[PDB]
């Protein structure tokens, strides 16, 4: 019944993934041992969406864990929930990607993908009706960017009609840890624009802006960033895991969210987010969830939506709430902000409403933006790429893996073609 | 957040530093090995390493080894990072030009490298606290070399400066007037608030209030550090009316060049008398307006007050302070300028003054540091430029400065620039 | 239902605000945790006016907390009620205002206002029907005076028809802690006269006079002053939080209180106030509440009303009381004191009567004066400003932030224009 297969690539993809599995195990009431310990029948009704039943009523999550180094598998397996995953589903190399896309895609991960893909088959053949693939990765570095997009290509060729749905942490100039980040991302975005049905563009600069300007955390870690990402991952699948007044499958999102085939680079958000010391003073209700959700400080990519227009927004609400009040606020937003929505679509907002809010809050909303403002994320990577590439800097590490200079020229060409298609509807 | 880099220069600055860091360690409960037994109150003055060792945000600089080799050997040898205790081979010889042009020219790019490695560990650095002698060769010449660099490297950051300044009669050197006048460009152009202090005024405070008949420099430095603890207390602690290091300057400094406040502290008191005085808020406020407690030998009654910062600490209440400053406004001998009708900036902090256990200065529920911009301080400049004039009319020691790379015209250009500051403080009283 | 958005600026605004949130949480029966623990349905009926509902029936107050330093946020968050507020609503810088208006308005707060204003949007979009903005600040120093009036300007431009209602602690000569206090206030009053719909002028000299000559406190703290201010803040909104014999919204006050657009500089008071050791000897009743309320020692600004005339007074009573007795006393006052009211208005007193008196007293009255005597508060600031400004003293700290000398000349010009309009109706 609409099973998902989930795949984790590199350090970032395994870290946002290993936090996601702690979040949806809390929702479904699954113990770190894999045993069920929840309150409610609704937690158990759709446990098959993310888990396999095994003997003694132990639940085993349908993750595949992929890396070119053992050290992230060792960090996940030893972690808060590490014992939950199937030992056979940890698929790994020994020598890493070197932060090189071409090691991921052509050498170190091209060896390993035959050992990954045949595990993706065992999980997809155990499904009753697979709806799709949910892949967590980063576009900087070499494992997530280059092996993860190799793996997207292989699963896309094998499962052409299932939803391919990716959560993609990607570079920005003011929060960076790699010299060759622009190269790896430009080579990787070239695969995402052709193969994925949805890609949720996420940024460490925007995830730090939520931690300082909303949550007021003094020292936000990667563990705090991974918690913001995984809340929106739990959010968008909610309507195939729980009952609701308006149900929306990942495909019911895609049909409404993607006007023209390639414009599927979304930008997620979440509400309510409150400063930890301030919760007692806030009224949780649909118009406050709306005034947070649609504000430029809440979105998890550096793009200010005031630099573009939305094509479509989806607001996937959770909790006991009025359909008049939801339909009123999703009208009031796009009429009072009409200069920020495209005027050749007569209603830009999809709504969905689940009856079951996250554990410990009365309501919640996961936001998905599609906006021409995502041109700014692809533009700044393309101009960092260009300034290195005009002087061929660092290319011997990629051409040493047998990659052509022509593949860089063709990747940055396809990047400007993606920038041009969003700028066309501005 | 709220860091300060403290730079201790020459013998006077280093020995005041050895009292400052003696105090700050007691006040934050840090052992002399930098460890802390059992809130981020220490963060202004100490970086914390993962071992649980608190390392001071300080640089100690001297052109000769003797005084810093004593810091490297005494009870604080384990407190400081070993490469932020910085020494040369050669003494500056009470010659400004050795400090500025010839000897300090070699150590400066190493002094800056430590200040860079401290500033890169700050997050919203509040300012610099620079400690020195006006009469020294390292004190005048090296501080003036360093400040010129910090004022291009860190142009926005507030530079607070604590200066031991030449007295009316007490002096340790023949060339103390030359080094002090050559320093007046540093304080005018490359400083934001400059606290002049005098050895002879503290010697008289010690005699009259502590009843110590014959004090050393350890007794002086234990008063000079106590004022900087009280300036920084609002940066370090909770209070009713905490004062930011720029909030302080916005009330002290009426005009860009008029940034030479007096400072005083009350109660200075011994254990013989502290149990018989009341030490009520009214008394310790009034003590700051006595000529007897000013730490520069000039009379405030020969001036007008421009602004006062009354920085209270310990057990005080805004009721008591307003009722106190109302009596100060009533007294016709304490005269403010016509253009400052408000006059007083009040700060109030909940942390009492820490006693150094070996010290003369007694335990008390309250203290105030009063920092005070007044026209009277121009007399301490009129004393010293009259000492300069007698010697420069003969060129009395000038060959030692000209011999070490200084232009002879800098003495005229420094006496000129001092006369323009002594003009500015007379001009604004009217 | 007539939601208010409340905003706190600088040390004073966050201190009178953080006490106000302890007072109205006692009224509405809200625990320091944010949980409801009250006696009565009437406490819960209008809890939405100042709070948001959140999961588990926790209430989160609709405050935004603004400062240029972390240390007041740290003092509020650690305080008696600090855990009530939303962590995202604490919006702050690192380097302070230096007691400089131009740092607040042009540099340090001009950076931060983009991060404040987008939180004011999340709270105002969560409202069902916003009636207004309730801003607490001081006119001395630099954060409340210069950033708070920047923020008034930004919210006024965005919400032109909602009530802008400010509580403004401001300088006086005998109780002062800043050298540049006159400058900061004169630059700030220039923004209040144009943008606010009401400004409640409050003074530390008058708040100390209440503590010594009425309450007989031996050592009144800022915590005792903040308690007098916050009693009148709770007072004026009472009629949208509780039922009454005569209801008055903040707009029903403004229409009656402001004859000509700019004459909205009010002067608050409260009754009963009694010496702590004397309460058993006093009869609480409408004519004793009146003989306190209308006496020159009770008002919270240094202006003796015997130096002017009132334009309008509003007396917002609370408790079970006769409308004949209220209407009798509000007549007897303005006929027996007729030389102290303007004689081109045929009745100078507005009355309102709420059925619910403050917890622990049988009746209460909040007083709002509008009087030509408020000329004396603006005059003495204008003459302290003038005596410094004739010699350009301290101006390099303001012109260093890129402010003109012409802006000081234009602020003191607009100050004398406000003095002249009150002196015109004398
Ligand atoms: C008493 C009270 O109000 O507790 C809240 C709370 O104070 C606040 C501040 C919580 C708290 O969130 C955080 O501290 C946080 C820190 C970094 C990054 C993200 C969150 C909370 O920890 C988070 C926690 O949320 C959940 O448990 C959700 O179900 C969430 N899952 C987890 O956070 C989780 C934690 C550990 C293990 C497994 C899951 C979730 C979100 C989306 C989809 C599914 C589940 C809640 C309600 C609270 C606390 C406990 C303080 C907030 O988060 C959520 C998701 O509600 C942060 O802003 C909201 C507003 C809440 O009021
Ligand atoms: C047995 C008795 O008579 O108790 C009284 C009392 O003695 C007196 C002196 C109280 C008392 O007030 C003070 O001590 C005080 C001190 C400094 C500044 C302001 C007040 C009282 O504390 C204050 C308290 O008032 C309240 O609780 C109100 O609801 C008030 N809220 C708070 O004071 C409060 C305190 C802690 C936490 C949260 C709120 C309020 C005022 C306006 C609008 C809403 C609420 C009351 C009745 C009393 C005591 C307890 C002695 C008085 O105050 C009030 C508001 O009634 C001071 O003059 C009045 C007359 C009262 O008789
Ligand atoms: N209060 C106080 N004054 C001191 C101390 N040490 C020196 N002084 C004063 O320092 C002034 C002269 O400056 P120097 O001590 O010669 O300064 P210096 O930087 O070491 O000069 P150089 O040796 O030339 O480098 C005199 O007026 C002293 O009174 C001290 O520990 N405390
Ligand atoms: N949110 C998040 N970002 C991470 C995490 N670890 C690394 N990143 C960041 O995103 C990039 C991820 O690249 P990485 O995963 O190291 O490359 P790979 O291992 O070769 O795929 C890094 O440069 C970091 O800036 C993590 O745990 N969480
Ligand atoms: N009532 C009251 N007044 C205060 C408080 N704190 C400071 N004040 C006074 O009012 C002025 C407020 O200025 P401040 O808030 O410090 O300036 P800012 O922080 O830059 O906005 C001070 O000079 C004090 O006299 C407080 O808690 N309550
Ligand atoms: Mg020396």
Numbering used by the authors:
A (entry chain Z), C (entry chain Y): 1 to 44, 47 to 360, 369 to 436
B (entry chain k): 1 to 38, 46 to 437
What are the paper's exact sentences on this?
The γ-tubulin ring complex (γ-TuRC) is a structural template for de novo microtubule assembly from α/β-tubulin units. The isolated vertebrate γ-TuRC assumes an asymmetric, open structure deviating from microtubule geometry, suggesting that γ-TuRC closure may underlie regulation of microtubule nucleation. Here, we isolate native γ-TuRC-capped microtubules from Xenopus laevis egg extract nucleated through the RanGTP-induced pathway for spindle assembly and determine their cryo-EM structure. In eukaryotes, the γ-tubulin ring complex (γ-TuRC) functions as the major MT nucleator, which is essential for cell viability.
While γ-TuRC-derived density segments are well resolved in the reconstruction obtained after γ-TuRC-focused 3D refinement, the density representing the emanating MT is locally less well-defined, indicative of structural plasticity at the interface between γ-TuRC and MT. We therefore expanded the focus of the 3D refinement from the γ-TuRC to the entire MT minus end, enabling us to resolve all individual MT protofilaments. Consistent with Moiré pattern analysis and computational particle sorting of capped MT minus ends, we observed 13 well-defined MT protofilaments growing from the γ-TuRC, in spite of the imperfect superposition of γ-tubulin 1 and 14 along the helical axis. However, in contrast to the canonical view of the 13 protofilament MT lattice, the growing MT is characterised by substantial asymmetry in terms of protofilament positions and contacts with their neighbours and the γ-TuRC. To gain more insight into the positioning and interactions of the MT protofilaments, we created a model of the MT at capped minus ends by rigid-body docking of protofilaments into the reconstruction, followed by rotation of each protofilament to reflect known lateral inter-protofilament contacts and optimisation of the fit along the longitudinal axis. To accommodate the larger radius of the only partially closed γ-TuRC at spokes 11 to 14, the protofilaments associated with spokes 11, 12 and 13 are positioned further away from the MT axis. As a consequence of the increased circumference of the MT, not all MT protofilaments engage in lateral interactions with their respective neighbours. Most strikingly, the protofilament at spoke 2 exhibits substantial gaps to both adjacent protofilaments, while at the same time a lateral misalignment of nearly 2 nm with γ-tubulin of spoke 2 exists. Similarly, the protofilaments corresponding to spokes 3 to 6 are offset around 1 nm from the respective γ-tubulins when looking along the MT axis.
